[PDB]
């Protein structure tokens, strides 16, 4: 009955873009699984914050399917996601089953690497735009949060709450989103 | 030299109110030490995100003094901070040395527990106002970020960026604060 979310955590991930969505989704009653790309070991994020995943991606991948697969940003983190064959398979399967895919900041560049959702209108961190647009497989947007069907993208740490709340609305509805939002004291 | 910051991490701390300041301060070139209240073991935050401290508070306390002591929020986390004799001593020392003390959400209630900065104008998460105002030792504010001398407070996850940038400006200046802010893509 409860929606499930898979958050793929790789070394170099932007910790704020990882923690805000995980926190907000759990406030929404979503069962969130933080899966480590390299395994079950703790992950050293971009600003040295060390986060211990709930499980390895290899294991979490066997506990699917998920209502949403979340790709945090962070330059080095995104590169790790982009080079992962496991991630490629996870996203292809999610896209095939018509499941939501959400990526923030540099995270969307992983979609390009795995040829996911070509033709979609997307946004990324301003510094990741060129990389994301290489080949013109997507149409760029400056919106803080962009949702084109089952592809949901966002721009950076500063858009993480909007990003997370958009995921919540897509999975649990806007009433729940509004309920979760109020206590956050967002402007 | 570079400024130093001490972030006291206790079980039940709100992970967003912990990670955002740590991340933003490090982007500001501030040497941040995430110290675990109970020790050097991983800490289970309010929304189950597990964070590994850089060191135990016991050891971090020996590497002082710090230019700012940061108290994250989270109902249960703030309660642990409020009940800690180690925290009481650290804050008293910081207050006596005229060093900055910054607390967010429920975090300010730890200031009350340790009789820190009485008379200061402060803010807290709306649900922590009554606890903070017990006895009328402070004057309450609705401002998203309140700074009365060396006592800096904020309201919640949604004010974490404002809170963190306020700390940066207080330690490294308005110029550095603006430089760090731009890449965040804040609204």
Q: Check if the beta carbon of residue A125 is closer than 8 Å to that of residue A73.
A: yes
What is the spatial distance between Cα A29 and Cα B106, in angstroms, rounded to a whole number?
22
What is the spatial distance between Cα B104 and Cα A108, in angstroms, rounded to a whole number?
32
Contacts of A178 (CB under 8 A, 6+ apart): none
- Partners of B47 on chain A (C-beta within 8 Å) are 22-23, 26-27
What is the spatial distance between Cα A108 and Cα B13, in angstroms, rounded to a whole number?
30
> How do the domains of chain B map onto residue ranges?
1-187
Backbone angles phi, psi at B5, to 5 degrees: -130, 140
Q: Check if the beta carbon of residue B132 is closer than 8 Å to that of residue B71.
A: no
DSSP letters for A58-115: HHHGGG---SEEEE---HHHHHHHHT-HHHHHHHHHHHHTT-EEEEETTTTHHHHHTT
- Partners of B159 on chain A (C-beta within 8 Å) are 185, 187
Structure resolution in Å? 1.7
From the list B16, B27, B155, the residue facing A20 with the nearest CB is: B16
Which is nearest to B167 in space by CA: B95, B61, B67? B67
Mark A10-37 as b/e (b = at least 16 C-beta within 10 Å): bbbbbbbbbbbbbbbbbbbebebbbbbb
- The residue behind tokens 């590169």 is A79
Phi/psi class of residue A65: alpha, beta or left (left: φ > 0; alpha: ψ in -120 to 50)?
Answer: beta
State the count of interchain CB pairs (< 8 A) between A and B: 100
What is the spatial distance between Cα A44 and Cα B113, in angstroms, rounded to a whole number?
34
Residue B124: strand, helix, or coil: coil
Nearest CA in chain A to B13: A23
Residue B172: strand, helix, or coil: helix
Residue A183 DSSP code: G
Residue B134 DSSP code: T
Name the method of structure determination: X-ray
Topology of domain A1-187 in CATH is Rossmann fold (3.40.50)
Contact between B51 and A50 using a beta-carbon 8 Å cutoff: yes
Residue B100 to residues A175, B68, B79, Cα–Cα distance (Å): 40, 5, 21
Structural tokens at position A129: 């735009």
What is the spatial distance between Cα A117 and Cα A145, in angstroms, rounded to a whole number?
16
Residue B115 DSSP code: T
């Amino acid at each position: 009955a409860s929606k499930r979310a898979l958050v793929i955590l790789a070394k170099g991930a932007e910790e704020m873009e990882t923690v805000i969505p995980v926190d907000v989704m759990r406030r929404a009653g979503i069962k969130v699984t933080v899966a480590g790309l390299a395994g079950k070991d703790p992950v050293q994020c971009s600003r040295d914050v060390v986060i211990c995943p709930d499980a390895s991606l290899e294991d979490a991948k066997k506990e699917g399917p998920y209502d949403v697969v979340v790709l945090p940003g962070g330059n080095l983190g995104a590169q790790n996601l982009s080079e992962s064959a496991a991630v490629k398979e996870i996203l292809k399967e999610q896209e095939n089953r018509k499941g939501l895919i959400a990526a923030i900041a540099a995270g969307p560049t992983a979609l390009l690497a795995h040829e996911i959702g070509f033709g979609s209108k997307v946004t990324t961190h301003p510094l990741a735009k060129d990389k994301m647009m290489n080949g013109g497989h997507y149409t760029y947007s400056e919106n803080r949060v962009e949702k084109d069907g089952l592809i949901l993208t966002s721009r950076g740490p500063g858009t993480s709450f909007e990003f997370a709340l958009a995921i919540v609305e897509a999975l649990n509805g806007k009433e729940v989103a509004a309920q979760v939002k109020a206590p956050l004291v967002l402007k």
